[PDB]
Amino acid sequence: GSMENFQKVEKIGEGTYGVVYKARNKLTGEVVALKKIRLDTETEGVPSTAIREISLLKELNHPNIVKLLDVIHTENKLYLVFEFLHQDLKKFMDASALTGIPLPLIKSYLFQLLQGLAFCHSHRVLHRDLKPQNLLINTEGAIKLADFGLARAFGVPVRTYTHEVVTLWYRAPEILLGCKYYSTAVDIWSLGCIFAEMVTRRALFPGDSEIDQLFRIFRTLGTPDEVVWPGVTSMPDYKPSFPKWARQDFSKVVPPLDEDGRSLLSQMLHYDPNKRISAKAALAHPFFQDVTKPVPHLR
């Protein structure tokens, strides 16, 4: 009877352990999204993905991170209550087929995504599943990070964590090659793949298997060697039989972009994770010298 003040409106989508509806608070008027977890079918108690998602999101309050409003623990169920946003970035790109997305809107969305990710990293959190489906937009020009069910708290210096994380098309080369240690640089590689996709409106590296994904990255950026990336020929899944492709001209990778734009994308896609740019340093890049906040055309 603890959900007495909410009225259901319509279903939004499906998920891992939970399913998601749009609802309305009958006393205040507030619109929300509700995620439900059944515990009846749970022979192991509260799931480890829900325990990480709630403990970490309570600590993260920022304008470009989606807000957790309440947790309700009645009966054989656990309900999570979130602020409501109107649409996802993957749906919005599909609807922009004919016009395309104007450059000042692209520049404002990237600047805002970099502010939210720097806040995560300064508070010792890795996200590990950045993709257009998990990024949400409203009618006043804002964009926000969502879905923290695959996230984790890290230490200084890191130790070995779960392998083969991140959806395949958005996954960094140090995870594909089996390296013992990974950190904050894996989330920057995913956002660079997303910047290219907003400009061309198709995925940059769409592979069907782990070896197919690696050979697509090599044909665009060149096969890496010891000069470009010290230590690379010693990694667990590196092989001496890999073909050897030449690196290509960046003006040909995303042809509509200007000189400042090409400079920033090449620093987000550096092979060596020690030399790859941080979210904090990227905020001062000259690409952002004339940034504003446009509203989008929705419906």
Binding site: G45, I51, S55, A153, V156, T184
Partner: protein, 257 residues
Amino acid sequence: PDYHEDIHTYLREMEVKCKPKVGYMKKQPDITNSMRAILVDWLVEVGEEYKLQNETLHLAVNYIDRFLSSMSVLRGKLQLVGTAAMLLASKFEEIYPPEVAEFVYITDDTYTKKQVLRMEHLVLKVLTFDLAAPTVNQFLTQYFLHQQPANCKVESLAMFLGELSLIDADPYLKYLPSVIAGAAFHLALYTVTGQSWPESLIRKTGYTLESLKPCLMDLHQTYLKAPQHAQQSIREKYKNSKYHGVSLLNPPETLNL
């Protein structure tokens, strides 16, 4: 490196908010410091049998101290509180945690599966889902970066002294995790190399040998009397070649402060 200073500042803020109440045991009707020492020694044993990380053990001990700061508990239920806290810490921190049936089995069937899962829910309610707490272990791995040069023996001995402090609520509940890590690091370095608390960590932390002195005099006595303590599981563990046999080194007779 890029975020090292931001992260050290944020953890110094959260250790004050996650701290237990210094005088709680005097207000518990039925349990004692000695019965708590017995529970913590048994948890060290469980972590060795299932091969769990040191960090998982430090987190479960923080959850127990916070719960008993606000809830009265009889001596026959203390073991059920500890089994539930070690289950939650494993789900938070480990790549492959043990199943619920394995936690039911190590209690020699003192408790049922249904009782263990209802206690998990009550601990989550009392701590309001606030589980990402700072530990002695998280401060030590940052301080290790200031060695010149690095020394495997100094690292393993500092972890061993920090672990012994988990066992005895009198006196270690009165000090913060960042302060106990400072005393363990200086004691290990001096024992092995003859060197002292370096100037580069005074600039990072703001702590000196004078501010560290009270915690240091307590930890020196603990180290000298360890072979006679009623609880012995931590000394057995640190005999292993994984930790370089550090528990067999002799303590210094005097410190000269």
